[PDB]
């Protein structure tokens, strides 16, 4: 009956679906729900339908999408219009967008990773929940003087403050319940009975949350939808100790890592010699995290990674860095080498696939905002438009297409 839900294999070294091994030929597409909405709510459904076609044609079987976003709608640095402008109150025009995303995905035989919250500010996230509870809407956004560490310590109260946390979490739960139980208006299916969803993911990139928190949340989610896998969203950017705190629990079915060389100060795109130090880092990152996954006997996916355009061709001009016309040779080699390393590890069942960050499609950073002020592409509005996006005609597209073909070949070999 349940032939079609993605499962863990019984040895615990990869995924199964339709009784066969299942490898992740993935991409991130967090802007999907918003592009799926009607024109009245700032959507562009004909564009969404086309962007999914482009992805199927390049060999993609899995999308990691965003399934939350918090008002109020008068805030900078976030998706607008919001999905849930106030607690328990929903924008139905935006919800319908998500219905459509999951229906298209279906017609293209793709599966979805459903992200239910955000630690960062671009969909409201944990910072907004805290604001709602303290009644103080002045979130310390990290611009000007406010540093990242200062904003981080503010949002972390969602689970580290003994008075805030219980309240915050109650409202957080209300949302999960609502989504798990949504009836798809386009095709009738209840979300929790839908084999198109691969898994429910707690949140994007929790920052040093305690183990007990992971323990209770995973259990809650699993009980809400017993047919589905359950995932954590961790970057795994620290040590093995950090890795275990998040992943070692009955109801965390598999593991994740996100890799960001520029953001962490490893790689500098304006430096023409900068590339090989980043390649080494990528290399060691994949093997160390592999061991950690093995130690717990669970599968692993690199659900996030990316790189800038060739800024070093004109280092003294900041804007040159974001033009679509600027080439991506550093980025193309960096991708290629990591794909080749993953193919070889999955040959030996020590790695399950990946999702690059992120697909831009038809969007371009030179286009004007829509009426809600959104320039829709792969880069969230806390970040310069066009930073990391892969456009429909970039040269990196061939590279992604080839990697997907190589990894399907590996999947067939392990089915013998």
Ligand X SMILES: OC[C@H]1O[C@@H](O[C@H]2[C@H](O)[C@H](O)[C@@H](O)O[C@@H]2CO)[C@@H](O)[C@@H](O)[C@@H]1O
The residues that touch ligand X, with contacts defined as CB under 6 A, are: 120, 148, 204-205, 235, 260, 263, 304, 357, 380, 383, 388
Shortest distance, position 197 Cβ to ligand X, whole Å: 20
Task: Compute the distance between CA of residue 152 and CA of residue 136 in angstroms, rounded to an integer.
Answer: 17
Reduce the DSSP state of residue 300 to 3 states and report it: strand
CB closer to ligand X out of 249 and 258: 258
Nearest residue to 51 via CA among 392, 315, 289, 352: 392
Beta carbons within 8 Å of 113's beta carbon, 6+ residues apart: 62, 63, 64, 65, 198, 199, 201, 231, 303, 355
The end-to-end CA distance of the chain, in Å, is 24
Shortest distance, position 204 Cβ to ligand X, whole Å: 5
Shortest distance, position 383 Cβ to ligand X, whole Å: 6
CB closer to ligand X out of 51 and 235: 235
Shortest distance, position 120 Cβ to ligand X, whole Å: 5
Shortest distance, position 358 Cβ to ligand X, whole Å: 7
Shortest distance, position 186 Cβ to ligand X, whole Å: 28
CA triplet 103, 107, 111: central angle to 5 degrees?
A: 70
CB closer to ligand X out of 22 and 359: 359
Reduce the DSSP state of residue 354 to 3 states and report it: strand
Shortest distance, position 368 Cβ to ligand X, whole Å: 22
Residue count of the chain:
416
CB closer to ligand X out of 188 and 265: 265
CB closer to ligand X out of 64 and 189: 64
Beta carbons within 8 Å of 124's beta carbon, 6+ residues apart: 69, 70, 71, 75, 78, 82, 118
Task: Compute the distance between CA of residue 27 and CA of residue 6 in angstroms, rounded to an integer.
Answer: 17
DSSP E strands: which ranges in 116-208? 197-201
CB closer to ligand X out of 96 and 400: 400
CB closer to ligand X out of 128 and 184: 128
Reduce the DSSP state of residue 415 to 3 states and report it: coil
């Amino acid at each position: 009956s349940e032939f079609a839900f993605v499962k863990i294999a019984s040895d615990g070294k990869g995924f199964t679906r339709y009784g066969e091994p299942y490898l992740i030929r993935g991409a991130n597409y967090w802007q999907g729900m918003n592009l799926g909405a009607d024109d009245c709510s700032g959507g562009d459904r004909k564009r969404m339908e086309l962007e999914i076609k482009q992805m199927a044609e390049m060999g993609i079987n899995n999308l990691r999408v965003m399934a939350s976003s918090e008002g109020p709608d008068d805030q900078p640095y976030r998706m607008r219009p919001s999905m849930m402008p106030q607690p328990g109150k929903y924008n139905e025009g935006v919800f319908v967008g998500l219905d459509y995303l999951l229906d298209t995905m279906d017609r293209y035989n793709m599966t979805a990773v459903m992200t239910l919250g955000n630690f960062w500010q671009w969909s409201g996230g944990f910072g907004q929940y805290v604001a709602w509870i303290t009644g103080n809407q002045t979130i310390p956004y990290p611009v000007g003087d406010v540093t990242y560490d200062e904003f981080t310590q503010f949002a972390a109260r969602f689970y580290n403050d003994s008075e805030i946390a219980p309240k915050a979490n109650k409202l957080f739960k209300d949302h999960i319940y609502t989504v798990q139980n949504r009836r798809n208006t386009v095709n009738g299916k209840i979300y929790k009975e839908d084999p198109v969803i691969m898994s429910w993911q707690i949140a994007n990139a929790p920052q040093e949350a305690p183990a007990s928190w992971f323990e209770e949340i995973s259990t809650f989610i699993k009980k809400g939808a017993p047919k589905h896998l359950v995932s954590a969203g961790l970057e795994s950017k620290l040590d093995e100790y950090d890795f275990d705190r998040a992943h070692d629990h009955k109801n965390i079915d598999y593991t994740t890592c996100h890799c960001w060389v520029e953001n962490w100060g490893i790689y500098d795109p304006a430096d023409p010699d900068g590339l090989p130090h980043a390649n080494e880092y990528m290399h060691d990152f994949l093997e160390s995290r592999s061991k950690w996954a093995a130690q717990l006997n669970k599968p692993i996916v690199m659900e996030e990674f990316g790189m800038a355009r060739d800024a070093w061709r004109n280092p003294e001009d900041e804007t040159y860095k974001y033009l679509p016309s600027t080439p991506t040779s550093h980025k193309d080699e960096y991708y290629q080498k990591a794909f080749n390393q993953i193919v070889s590890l999955a040959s030996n069942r020590s790695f399950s696939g990946s999702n690059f960050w992120a697909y831009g499609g038809e969007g371009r950073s030179t286009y004007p905002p829509n009426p809600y002020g959104m320039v829709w592409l792969g880069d969230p509005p806390h970040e310069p438009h066009g930073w990391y996006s892969v456009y429909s005609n970039d040269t990196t597209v061939q590279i992604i297409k080839d990697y997907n073909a190589n990894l399907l070949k590996v999947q067939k070999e392990l089915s013998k």
